[model samples]
Target: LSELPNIGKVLEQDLIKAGIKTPVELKDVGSKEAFLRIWENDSSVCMSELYALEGAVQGIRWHGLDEAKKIELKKFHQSLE
Candidate 1:
């Protein structure tokens, strides 16, 4: 997982300690409410953190992907909405 914007190595490690390791798992967290519950005791898991996680995941998926694959992934990302 990439270090989310304001979340550095220490914060990333903290997140892992809270059971968030992969971007896919982060994406599958379902909703902001769920995230809030999971990280209720931690202040780092805010709305901005969630958005940054999503962006980081998308960025990772985008890099090293071919144009055709990116188009396909774009469609899949859109379908998640």
Candidate 2:
């Protein structure tokens, strides 16, 4: 997980604790579901985390993500209840 782009130690720990044990598992879960799983444990799950997950899954830096995708992610985050 740490090897994944946009993922550091803390984020790796969070993902593992959230039930995504490996990079394969994380990719399988996809960004949105992974974010939801992490959010289940921590409401502090913000848009940045979502972006990071997407970036990790895509194997790129979060900032490299597209503006359209960012907006979509923002909508997803804001829609969380």
Candidate 3:
């Protein structure tokens, strides 16, 4: 997790709380599930964090995420279904 860009101390703790202690574990969980797990653990988890998680999984910076992918991630994170 620390190897990934933009994931600082706060996210480290959040990830741990969300049962993601290792970067490999993140791959197993996938970005969307990881984001959702973190969201469940912490209500403050937001779209920016979701974008960052997905970008990290894709080996890119959060700002480097494509618009369509960002939209899809947000939709999954925000929607009831």
Candidate 4:
């Protein structure tokens, strides 16, 4: 998890507390659910957190994610209602 570009101590802790215990498990769950799980843990999670998860899953930089990708992610986030 630490080896992943955007993942750090805080994000790693949040992910685990949200039931994402391993990088392998993360891949299985995919970015959207992982972000939702962390958000479900506590509603204070960042939009950047979601982007980072997507980037990590796709092997890119979170900041590098395009507007189109962000829009898609937000759509999924909205769908969780």
Candidate 5:
């Protein structure tokens, strides 16, 4: 999980706290649900964090995520708060 793109120490720990222990689990959970899990533990999750999770699932960097997906996630984030 930590070796995945866009996942640093803090984000790794947060993911672990969210019960996401492995890259396989993360991919299975998907970005939106993974973010929801982390948000359940911490409300400070932002768009960048969601992008990071999305990137990790795809094995790419957050900046490389598609614009349309980013826009969709923006809407999802907005719905959260």
Candidate 6:
């Protein structure tokens, strides 16, 4: 998990317990509604997560990754499904 501003060790552990354990998992989450579900109404999501995810999605969409790398990322997301 990337370091989230304002989220300390205990809160980070709580988030991990909620199944958000990696940046990849966070990216795969893909929606605020889904993230809200993951938090189970805790409402502790940091702004950093939101911003980081925005950047990640933009990178995935516009960074011009090679076809193979793009396919790999897609496969990674598929595993979440």
Q: Model 4, 5-47: lDDT tens per residue?
A: 7888999998878888888888999998898887777877777
* Best-matching candidate per TM-score: 5
User: What is the C-alpha lDDT profile of model 2 across 1-81, one tens digit per residue?
Assistant: 788898878889998899998999999889999999988899887678899989999979999999999999899988888
Go through the candidates in order and give each one's C-alpha lDDT: 0.50, 0.89, 0.82, 0.84, 0.90, 0.48
Off by over 4 Å in 3: none
Better of 4 and 5 by TM-score: 5
Q: What TM-score should be assigned to candidate 1?
A: 0.42
Pairs clashing within candidate 4: none
Q: Write the per-residue lDDT of candidate 6 for residues 1-81, one digit (tens) a residue.
A: 435333346545655777777656655775343345444646555544333344344454223436565455445444432
- Tens-place lDDT per residue, model 1, 1-81, is 554333457546755776777656656773243345446557444444444444454454224445675454445444433
List clashing residue pairs in candidate 6: none
Per-candidate TM equals 0.42, 0.94, 0.89, 0.85, 0.95, 0.38
> Which residue pairs clash within candidate 1?
none
RMSD of 5: 0.8
Candidate 1 deviant stretches above 4 angstroms:
3-7, 30-34, 43-47, 60-81
Q: Which candidate is the best by lDDT?
A: 5
lDDT: the better of candidates 3 and 5: 5
Error of 1 at 30 (Å): 4.9
TM-score of candidate 2 on Cα atoms, chains taken together: 0.94
Report the lDDT tens digits of candidate 5 across residue range 1-81: 788999999999989888999999998989999999989889888789999989899989889888999999999999997
Worst 10 residues of 5 by lDDT: 38-47
Candidates by TM-score, descending order: 5, 2, 3, 4, 1, 6
Candidate that beats the other on lDDT, 1 or 4, i.e. the better one: 4
